[PDB]
């Protein structure tokens, strides 16, 4: 039994040492980082906290963010675990009626 203290479905040594997600036929596989293969494919090496379920503390796990099992309205540059995902809302006023 491999440990995952952060309980985010992804073990701790992989989050420390680097990992990636890769499809093979139609199936996503959580590989640890190997520079001989994944670098040639252009896959991005990922590191995150072994003790944070969400390393950016946003309400989305590390695994959901790297897997894609997320609200798709999240911007693609926010799909990295060290990138936070949050709304910024402000209201403008176009017209007055008295």
């Amino acid at each position: 039994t491999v440990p995952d203290r952060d309980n985010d479905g992804i073990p701790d040594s992989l989050e420390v040492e680097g990992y990636t997600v890769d499809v093979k036929n139609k199936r996503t596989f959580l590989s640890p980082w190997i520079s001989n293969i994944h670098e040639k494919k252009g896959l991005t090496k990922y590191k995150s906290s072994p003790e944070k379920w969400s390393t950016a503390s946003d309400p989305y796990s590390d695994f959901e963010k790297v897997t894609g099992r997320i609200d798709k309205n999240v911007s693609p540059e926010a799909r990295h675990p060290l990138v936070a995902a949050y709304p910024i809302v402000h209201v403008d006023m176009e017209n007055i009626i008295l």
Binding site: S49, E51, Y60, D71, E77, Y86, H90, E94, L98
Partner: protein, 361 residues
């Protein structure tokens, strides 16, 4: 999801008329990023109620009514915004809204654990990104991998080193300048003291980031105001973008003006110079500057006819000079001078267009 802003009607300096939470008529179910509620083609929504069941109009007494009709200063503040998170379900894949949880729980957690970077190289628009960085005095926060500045700029803004040099699009990083608040500037000072380096641009792969940092990255070309909006360039830059003339007519000018550049120009000045030298200005008012239209083909169009009573220019002699000058936002005026000056006399104009009369048509 389920957006309910809490806003405030304010008169004057700080005379608050009212504070209103958004009611069920004012609910927004979805507000995806880079979007509006309602959409831009549709008309904005109406807020006119104070009750929780929306049965009382927003009331103003007499003195405030007089002051409003005198001063016309009625501002709107956004105090706080209610809204929920929808989370993924591992059961059926369906992302479902928890009505219990809200972003109120989450946003200060993000703010106290990340470094914030604001950048405006994408069409002069302030883009904010928060990146998780280590607070050394917090043991759980130290469990994160280390973040250099260059890696952060690469993953956050889509930067690259296509030739070993950090670039945003085709622009070098060295054409951008850095700004820090006092704590972050002090920490960067300490890190550069330890690294024994002077140029920050050389050591971007070594800058250790921390929580609660604030990094403003702007373009070195343009000039900025208090609110860090792009207000105006140097003369060398403004001229460089106008070296592409498409259509020369006595009705207007068609140019391929750069989209970034044009956004810091308030308007244009059109005059005619004698062969000995006179200054006869067609659009000789402070509010006769707006002639520059933007066609949907990506080419900015100047129009002489708009402020010449529907008629083209008047070429008394085809050996004169037709001058067209531009006005930056930092140089423009919006009211006449002290006495009565409704003219283009005291304006810092910039030479963009100067061609003869036989070279137009």
């Amino acid at each position: 999801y389920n957006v309910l802003p809490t806003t405030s009607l304010v008169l004057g300096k700080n005379q608050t008329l009212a504070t209103i939470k958004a009611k069920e008529n004012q609910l927004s179910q979805i507000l995806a990023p880079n979007n509006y509620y309602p959409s831009k083609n549709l008309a904005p929504i109406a807020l006119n109620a104070q009750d929780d069941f929306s049965s009382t109009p927003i009331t103003m007494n007499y003195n405030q009514f007089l002051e409003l009709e005198k001063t016309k200063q009625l501002r709107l503040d956004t105090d706080q915004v209610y809204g929920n998170i929808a989370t993924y379900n591992f059961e059926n894949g369906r992302v479902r809204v928890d009505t219990g949880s809200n972003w109120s729980e989450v946003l200060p957690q993000i703010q106290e654990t990340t470094a914030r970077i604001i950048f405006n190289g994408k069409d002069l628009n302030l883009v904010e990104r928060r990146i998780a960085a280590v607070n050394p005095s917090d043991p759980l926060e130290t469990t994160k991998p280390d973040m250099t500045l260059k890696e952060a700029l690469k993953i956050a803004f889509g930067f690259n080193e296509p030739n070993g040099n950090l670039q945003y699009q085709g622009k070098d990083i060295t054409e951008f300048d850095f700004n820090f608040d006092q704590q972050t500037s002090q920490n960067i000072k300490n890190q550069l003291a330890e690294l024994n380096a002077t140029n920050i641009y050389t050591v971007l792969d070594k800058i250790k980031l921390n929580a609660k940092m604030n990094i403003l990255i702007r373009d070195k070309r343009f000039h900025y105001d208090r609110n860090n909006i792009a207000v105006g360039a140097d003369e060398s830059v403004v001229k460089e973008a106008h070296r592409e003339v498409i259509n020369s007519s006595t009705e207007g000018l068609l140019l391929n003006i750069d989209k970034d550049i044009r956004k810091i120009l308030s308007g244009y000045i059109v005059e005619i110079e004698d062969t000995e030298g006179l200054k006869e200005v067609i659009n000789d008012r402070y509010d006769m500057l707006n002639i520059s239209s933007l066609r949907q083909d990506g080419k900015t169009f100047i129009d002489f006819k708009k402020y010449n009573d529907k008629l083209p220019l008047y070429i008394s002699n085809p050996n004169y000079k037709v001058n067209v000058y531009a006005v930056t936002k930092e140089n423009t005026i919006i009211n006449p001078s002290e006495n009565g000056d409704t003219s283009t006399n005291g304006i810092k104009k910039i030479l963009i267009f100067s061609k003869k009369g036989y070279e137009i048509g």
